[PDB]
Enzyme design. Structure first.
Site, PDB file in Angstrom:
ATOM      1  N   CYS B 108       0.833  -1.244   0.124  1.00  0.00           N
ATOM      2  CA  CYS B 108       0.040   0.054  -0.018  1.00  0.00           C
ATOM      3  C   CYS B 108       0.999   1.255  -0.043  1.00  0.00           C
ATOM      4  O   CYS B 108       1.742   1.535   1.062  1.00  0.00           O
ATOM      5  CB  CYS B 108      -1.082  -0.078   1.233  1.00  0.00           C
ATOM      6  SG  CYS B 108      -1.981   1.578   1.142  1.00  0.00           S
ATOM      7  N   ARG B 111       0.115   4.686   2.754  1.00  0.00           N
ATOM      8  CA  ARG B 111      -0.028   4.504   4.260  1.00  0.00           C
ATOM      9  C   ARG B 111       0.393   5.791   4.976  1.00  0.00           C
ATOM     10  O   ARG B 111       0.346   5.571   6.437  1.00  0.00           O
ATOM     11  CB  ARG B 111       0.968   3.290   4.525  1.00  0.00           C
ATOM     12  CG  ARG B 111       0.224   1.883   4.250  1.00  0.00           C
ATOM     13  CD  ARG B 111       1.398   0.713   4.584  1.00  0.00           C
ATOM     14  NE  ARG B 111       2.460   0.765   3.379  1.00  0.00           N
ATOM     15  CZ  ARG B 111       3.536   0.146   3.542  1.00  0.00           C
ATOM     16  NH1 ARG B 111       3.755  -0.530   4.901  1.00  0.00           N
ATOM     17  NH2 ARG B 111       4.400   0.053   2.779  1.00  0.00           N
ATOM     18  N   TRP B 280      -9.147   6.338  -1.065  1.00  0.00           N
ATOM     19  CA  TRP B 280      -9.565   7.083  -2.315  1.00  0.00           C
ATOM     20  C   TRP B 280      -8.538   6.636  -3.314  1.00  0.00           C
ATOM     21  O   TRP B 280      -7.392   5.851  -2.968  1.00  0.00           O
ATOM     22  CB  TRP B 280      -9.336   8.413  -2.208  1.00  0.00           C
ATOM     23  CG  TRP B 280      -8.171   8.997  -1.627  1.00  0.00           C
ATOM     24  CD1 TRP B 280      -6.839   9.188  -2.175  1.00  0.00           C
ATOM     25  CD2 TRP B 280      -7.949   9.578  -0.354  1.00  0.00           C
ATOM     26  NE1 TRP B 280      -5.843   9.747  -1.032  1.00  0.00           N
ATOM     27  CE2 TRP B 280      -6.746   9.718   0.050  1.00  0.00           C
ATOM     28  CE3 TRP B 280      -8.945   9.509   1.027  1.00  0.00           C
ATOM     29  CZ2 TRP B 280      -6.218  10.461   1.418  1.00  0.00           C
ATOM     30  CZ3 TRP B 280      -8.591   9.996   2.198  1.00  0.00           C
ATOM     31  CH2 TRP B 280      -7.036  10.449   2.348  1.00  0.00           C
ATOM     32  N   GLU B 285      -4.726   3.701 -11.060  1.00  0.00           N
ATOM     33  CA  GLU B 285      -5.474   2.553 -10.542  1.00  0.00           C
ATOM     34  C   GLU B 285      -6.616   2.373 -11.824  1.00  0.00           C
ATOM     35  O   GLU B 285      -6.840   1.381 -12.470  1.00  0.00           O
ATOM     36  CB  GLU B 285      -5.882   2.512  -9.261  1.00  0.00           C
ATOM     37  CG  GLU B 285      -5.194   2.558  -7.981  1.00  0.00           C
ATOM     38  CD  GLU B 285      -5.792   2.284  -6.657  1.00  0.00           C
ATOM     39  OE1 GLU B 285      -6.231   1.493  -6.567  1.00  0.00           O
ATOM     40  OE2 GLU B 285      -5.587   3.561  -6.036  1.00  0.00           O
TER      41      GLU B 285
HETATM   42  C1  HEM Z   1      -6.458   6.466   1.576  1.00  0.00           C
HETATM   43  C2  HEM Z   1      -5.984   6.159   0.257  1.00  0.00           C
HETATM   44  C3  HEM Z   1      -5.066   5.199  -0.229  1.00  0.00           C
HETATM   45  C4  HEM Z   1      -4.471   5.019  -1.493  1.00  0.00           C
HETATM   46  C5  HEM Z   1      -4.394   6.257  -2.173  1.00  0.00           C
HETATM   47  C6  HEM Z   1      -4.112   3.745  -1.466  1.00  0.00           C
HETATM   48  C7  HEM Z   1      -3.304   3.160  -2.606  1.00  0.00           C
HETATM   49  C8  HEM Z   1      -3.055   1.905  -2.799  1.00  0.00           C
HETATM   50  C9  HEM Z   1      -2.796   1.590  -3.771  1.00  0.00           C
HETATM   51  C10 HEM Z   1      -2.409   2.302  -5.300  1.00  0.00           C
HETATM   52  C11 HEM Z   1      -2.532   0.066  -4.003  1.00  0.00           C
HETATM   53  C12 HEM Z   1      -2.431  -0.888  -5.101  1.00  0.00           C
HETATM   54  C13 HEM Z   1      -3.569  -1.282  -5.595  1.00  0.00           C
HETATM   55  C14 HEM Z   1      -3.600  -1.986  -6.756  1.00  0.00           C
HETATM   56  O1  HEM Z   1      -2.710  -1.709  -7.720  1.00  0.00           O
HETATM   57  O2  HEM Z   1      -4.435  -2.804  -7.178  1.00  0.00           O
HETATM   58  C15 HEM Z   1      -2.817  -0.019  -2.455  1.00  0.00           C
HETATM   59  C16 HEM Z   1      -2.894  -1.319  -1.771  1.00  0.00           C
HETATM   60  C17 HEM Z   1      -3.489  -1.860  -0.658  1.00  0.00           C
HETATM   61  N1  HEM Z   1      -3.824  -0.689   0.403  1.00  0.00           N
HETATM   62 FE1  HEM Z   1      -3.947   1.105  -0.053  1.00  0.00          FE
HETATM   63  N2  HEM Z   1      -4.442   3.269  -0.210  1.00  0.00           N
HETATM   64  C18 HEM Z   1      -5.208   3.801   0.551  1.00  0.00           C
HETATM   65  C19 HEM Z   1      -6.015   3.375   1.727  1.00  0.00           C
HETATM   66  C20 HEM Z   1      -6.002   2.065   2.225  1.00  0.00           C
HETATM   67  C21 HEM Z   1      -6.857   1.689   3.213  1.00  0.00           C
HETATM   68  C22 HEM Z   1      -7.613   2.542   4.110  1.00  0.00           C
HETATM   69  C23 HEM Z   1      -6.381   0.431   3.425  1.00  0.00           C
HETATM   70  C24 HEM Z   1      -6.904  -0.510   4.626  1.00  0.00           C
HETATM   71  C25 HEM Z   1      -7.346   0.165   5.967  1.00  0.00           C
HETATM   72  C26 HEM Z   1      -5.261  -0.043   2.323  1.00  0.00           C
HETATM   73  C27 HEM Z   1      -4.888  -1.215   2.406  1.00  0.00           C
HETATM   74  C28 HEM Z   1      -4.223  -1.663   1.267  1.00  0.00           C
HETATM   75  C29 HEM Z   1      -4.094  -3.145   1.185  1.00  0.00           C
HETATM   76  C30 HEM Z   1      -4.250  -4.074   2.023  1.00  0.00           C
HETATM   77  C31 HEM Z   1      -3.338  -3.273  -0.089  1.00  0.00           C
HETATM   78  C32 HEM Z   1      -2.986  -4.399  -0.894  1.00  0.00           C
HETATM   79  C33 HEM Z   1      -4.196  -4.872  -1.891  1.00  0.00           C
HETATM   80  C34 HEM Z   1      -4.265  -6.319  -2.184  1.00  0.00           C
HETATM   81  O3  HEM Z   1      -3.211  -7.105  -1.858  1.00  0.00           O
HETATM   82  O4  HEM Z   1      -5.060  -6.710  -3.136  1.00  0.00           O
HETATM   83  N3  HEM Z   1      -5.208   1.216   2.000  1.00  0.00           N
HETATM   84  N4  HEM Z   1      -3.086   0.937  -1.782  1.00  0.00           N
HETATM   85  C1  LIG Z   2      -4.210 -12.380  -7.159  1.00  0.00           C
HETATM   86  C2  LIG Z   2      -4.149 -11.252  -6.183  1.00  0.00           C
HETATM   87  C3  LIG Z   2      -3.857 -11.104  -4.821  1.00  0.00           C
HETATM   88  C4  LIG Z   2      -3.927  -9.868  -4.303  1.00  0.00           C
HETATM   89  N1  LIG Z   2      -3.318  -9.802  -3.052  1.00  0.00           N
HETATM   90  N2  LIG Z   2      -4.778  -9.119  -4.773  1.00  0.00           N
HETATM   91  C5  LIG Z   2      -5.365  -9.031  -5.810  1.00  0.00           C
HETATM   92  C6  LIG Z   2      -6.446  -7.765  -6.184  1.00  0.00           C
HETATM   93  C7  LIG Z   2      -6.153  -7.204  -7.563  1.00  0.00           C
HETATM   94  C8  LIG Z   2      -4.604  -6.500  -6.881  1.00  0.00           C
HETATM   95  N3  LIG Z   2      -4.543  -5.281  -8.069  1.00  0.00           N
HETATM   96  C9  LIG Z   2      -5.669  -5.507  -8.929  1.00  0.00           C
HETATM   97  C10 LIG Z   2      -6.646  -6.136  -7.961  1.00  0.00           C
HETATM   98  O1  LIG Z   2      -7.228  -5.195  -6.864  1.00  0.00           O
HETATM   99  C11 LIG Z   2      -8.043  -4.226  -7.170  1.00  0.00           C
HETATM  100  C12 LIG Z   2      -8.385  -3.548  -5.935  1.00  0.00           C
HETATM  101  C13 LIG Z   2      -7.416  -2.602  -5.499  1.00  0.00           C
HETATM  102  C14 LIG Z   2      -7.992  -1.236  -4.559  1.00  0.00           C
HETATM  103  C15 LIG Z   2      -6.673  -0.684  -3.742  1.00  0.00           C
HETATM  104  C16 LIG Z   2      -7.063   0.666  -3.140  1.00  0.00           C
HETATM  105  C17 LIG Z   2      -7.585   0.725  -1.778  1.00  0.00           C
HETATM  106  C18 LIG Z   2      -7.666   1.769  -1.251  1.00  0.00           C
HETATM  107  C19 LIG Z   2      -7.452   3.121  -2.011  1.00  0.00           C
HETATM  108  C20 LIG Z   2      -6.907   2.832  -3.125  1.00  0.00           C
HETATM  109  N4  LIG Z   2      -6.839   1.575  -3.871  1.00  0.00           N
HETATM  110  C21 LIG Z   2      -5.258 -10.177  -6.752  1.00  0.00           C
END
Ligand code: HEM
Ligand SMILES: Cc1cc(N)nc(C[C@@H]2CNC[C@@H]2OCCCCCc2ccccn2)c1
Ligand code: HEM
Ligand SMILES: Cc1cc(N)nc(C[C@@H]2CNC[C@@H]2OCCCCCc2ccccn2)c1
Ligand SMILES: C[C@H](O)[C@H](O)[C@H]1CNc2nc(N)[nH]c(=O)c2N1
Ligand SMILES: C[C@H](O)[C@H](O)[C@H]1CNc2nc(N)[nH]c(=O)c2N1
Ligand SMILES: [Zn+2]
Lengths: 407, 411
Positions: B108, B111, B280, B285
């Site tokens: 993330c 953070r 947000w 994305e």
């Molecule tokens: C507040 C603005 C936030 C922004 C701009 C942001 C940005 C991002 C981005 C760009 C990713 C990668 C997403 C992707 O490529 O699909 C991500 C992943 C993630 N963020 Fe955030 N994030 C935010 C808030 C949060 C919040 C509120 C949480 C949880 C409380 C969080 C937990 C995570 C987690 C767990 C991932 C990994 C998702 C996965 O493995 O599928 N983030 N974040």
């Molecule tokens: C195979 C797999 C593993 C994993 N950890 N996570 C995913 C989900 C995929 C990771 N990138 C595309 C899809 O996730 C989409 C949702 C991510 C939104 C994250 C976010 C959360 C809060 C603010 C901004 N962005 C797939």
């Protein structure tokens, strides 16, 4: 133990078994991944030699043949007696091609078996090294029709008689820090540029001065040589649409030629082994031109493009970046100098990975280096899972010689 | 032991001691790196130590480690585990845990915001209708008329694994996908499988390019039930471009609220299988991945066509050119409509400042470079040049398999 890699764009799954032959360590543990860190006796030599000769005889379908056992025997006798051994020409060539094959950071490996190997193991002086390197540069350049090549100087002995090219690449541009605190030329090379002056070079003090070679033979102090300018193919950078672009006065050289790595084959170490292929356009246009600690030209191009530079969110840097990279490709193509764009190179690498999985059981690959520094997710490698592991023969990074050498 | 990371643009070097608190596994070994692999019922024997480790962290954070309150709570939890085989978190612990799971989320980039998280405790929830109501409230609160606020809603923890709460949707708001008989896809190809499940469950599909999916909600291990989010609660942004007036006629829009709903929150060994959270968007994305992935809306061709770019050779970089324009359009559109969004330059700069701060105050910041570096313009963002160490800390968010693969249908 048998591992799967998936492509998330295509669902193609490949099974990796080749990793089970890896020997050296990654930097990673069960508790920490170091995937993004740039740099994470007679007894020792014989298993190394055996491992290698086994793979060589296997490769020529002669594993367990009398010639295999006899060569193992001969190398063993030679080690016990001399404390080292000499590779046959066939083995040297095989080893060098395989060091490239195993280079997990190289996107260009589809080409690995077309490598011209120049055996320079008979070299004894820096003037000799200069001659061999000029010949390499001319062969590799081939008037713009670039051909991959490596030149291999004598192997390490006691470690006090190393051959080294002090230059990090055979051809690079000089860097000089100026009175007003800024940098003229390539900031990457300021230290090296001063060491060249310290040893005698007469810097023309310009922005794109091809550096002299600083060559170390047999552990002696290094000596300066200027590569014949007629051997250095350079490309003026223009844009197919923006006529102001040429006014920036940018150029780059055609031949990327890495010269500071160490080639390990069958336990033997080749500390001077300059190699060259051709450029992928982003190496020049994204990294060399736009890194903040390099030529750092984004701000200048963006101004000439009349872009809104007030806010990051207008993506002015991104817009300029693309145009700069269109120009590099266009310029090389116009001047008939081999270059490859990142879409084409990465598509080749996926095809290469599939070949390697099919014919070899895997392909070591470092995603952090393989994915291009722009437009990552619109290239197929972004969506491709890769397992990174270390196989030998290999190219290894080594410390800059100035921290090592005693004069 | 100490571990150093270097930024190759600035030569700033940081020292990581936090990695010593890590116990979970990475997937890597000294012989293989799995850094680019996407994915590399508890007994009491296992539960006590995990509970203890968490309560120790919690009590240290409040400057009460070793206090009577700390010791009493350990005793209380211990007794509850041996008596009931599980335990309940105090509200303050649940909040701390959820904030730290975000803080620890190495993928993330967002953070810097971790300590500002609104936690909605939904542990008193018993039915899917109850889950619907909690999720509606979360969406309305988080959306805040375009002035987005981070939030998480936490449903009851796992018990025997036969009674799980789950949101079947991978995000609270996403668009339907429909595979056509001719093999083309209408709407979002990522959601074809889920769309088909919804239809089977009785959803009447509008069959357009941007149909907001119904929620499919499972409470207490029961069969999931369908609900339509009130459309007045779903904020969307029509996509237009500041210079290209033909861009609007592409008919693109996206939703404002990115709300992940398929992950598992682990706190003190307890498993929260339904814990939708939202922040947000970073522009890329939507503009890079959702719009330009070949397996998603895949709009590069059409945009490039309308731009009259030279599309006959990849070396014209027509794809790269169209990519940048699309991302300009996404940011412009959100900004013009006053819906929170951050560009990838600003977000990565903030992440670096966050990471350095975390090294100073915490001794480290686990970070996954493969995910942190944006999917366009990688090396013109500061994170490209930053060495990162990836390791797993708890509390954590974990991937879990899609519920349709595991669910025992009650019928
Ligand atoms: C507040 C603005 C936030 C922004 C701009 C942001 C940005 C991002 C981005 C760009 C990713 C990668 C997403 C992707 O490529 O699909 C991500 C992943 C993630 N963020 Fe955030 N994030 C935010 C808030 C949060 C919040 C509120 C949480 C949880 C409380 C969080 C937990 C995570 C987690 C767990 C991932 C990994 C998702 C996965 O493995 O599928 N983030 N974040
Ligand atoms: C195979 C797999 C593993 C994993 N950890 N996570 C995913 C989900 C995929 C990771 N990138 C595309 C899809 O996730 C989409 C949702 C991510 C939104 C994250 C976010 C959360 C809060 C603010 C901004 N962005 C797939
Ligand atoms: C034929 C055209 C070739 C192309 C297009 C190519 C492409 C590349 C690229 C883009 C990189 C990343 C370098 C960077 O970002 O600075 C790279 C790294 C590398 N390639 Fe190649 N390659 C080619 C030929 C070769 C050859 C001939 C060898 C050796 C025989 C080689 C071995 C390597 C090694 C060892 C690295 C890692 C360098 C390092 O760690 O500094 N490649 N390749
Ligand atoms: C600290 C460090 C470690 C390492 N392994 N390598 C380097 C050299 C840096 C890494 N990327 C930029 C620079 O290397 C530039 C030379 C690579 C040119 C590679 C090449 C070779 C052949 C064809 C096309 N391109 C530095
Ligand atoms: C810190 C990080 O590992 C470093 O910036 C890397 C990232 N990926 C790279 N990839 C390539 N091809 N070349 C590089 O120099 C780098 N630098
Ligand atoms: C194979 C590879 O790990 C995979 O495509 C990753 C790369 N980096 C990513 N980074 C982000 N933020 N999101 C992603 O989905 C991915 N996908
Ligand atoms: Zn690793």
């Amino acid at each position: 133990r048998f591992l799967k890699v998936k492509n998330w764009e295509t669902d193609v799954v490949l099974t990796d078994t080749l990793h089970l032959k890896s020997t050296l360590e990654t930097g990673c543990t069960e508790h920490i991944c170091m995937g993004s860190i740039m740099l994470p006796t007679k007894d020792q030599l014989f298993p190394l030699a055996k491992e290698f000769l086994d793979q060589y005889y296997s490769s020529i379908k002669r594993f367990g043949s009398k010639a295999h056992m006899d060569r193992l025997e001969e190398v063993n006798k030679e080690i016990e007696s001399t404390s080292t051994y000499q590779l046959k020409d066939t083995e040297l060539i095989y080893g060098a091609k395989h060091a490239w094959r195993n280079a997990s950071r190289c996107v260009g490996r589809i080409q690995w078996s077309k490598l011209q190997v120049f055996d320079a193991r008979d070299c004894t002086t820096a003037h000799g090294m200069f001659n061999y390197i000029c010949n390499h540069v001319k062969y590799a350049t081939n008037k713009g029709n670039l051909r991959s090549a490596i030149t291999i100087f004598p192997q390490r002995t006691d470690g006090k008689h190393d051959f080294r090219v002090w230059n990090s690449q055979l051809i690079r541009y000089a860097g000089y820090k100026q009175p007003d605190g800024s940098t003229l030329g390539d900031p990457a090379n300021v230290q090296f540029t001063e060491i060249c002056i310290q040893q005698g070079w007469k810097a023309p003090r310009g922005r794109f001065d091809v550096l002299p070679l600083l060559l170390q033979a047999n552990g002696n102090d290094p000596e300066l040589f200027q590569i014949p300018p007629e051997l250095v193919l350079e490309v003026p950078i223009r844009h197919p649409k923006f006529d102001w672009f040429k006014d920036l006065g940018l150029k780059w050289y055609g031949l990327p030629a890495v010269s500071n790595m160490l080639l390990e084959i069958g336990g033997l170490e080749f500390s001077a082994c300059p190699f060259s292929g051709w450029y992928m356009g982003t190496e020049i246009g994204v990294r060399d031109y736009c890194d903040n600690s390099r030529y750092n030209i984004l701000e200048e191009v963006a101004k000439k493009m009349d872009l809104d530079m007030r806010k990051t969110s207008s993506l002015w840097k991104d817009q300029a970046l693309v145009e700069i990279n269109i120009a590099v490709l266009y310029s090389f193509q116009s001047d008939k100098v081999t270059i490859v764009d990142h879409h084409s190179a990465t598509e080749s690498f996926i095809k290469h990975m599939e070949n390697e999985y099919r014919c070899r059981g895997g392909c070591p690959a470092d995603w952090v280096w393989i994915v291009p520094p722009m437009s990552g997710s619109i290239t197929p490698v972004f969506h491709q899972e890769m397992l990174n592991y270390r196989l030998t023969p290999s190219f290894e990074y080594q410390p800059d010689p100035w921290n090592t050498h005693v004069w």
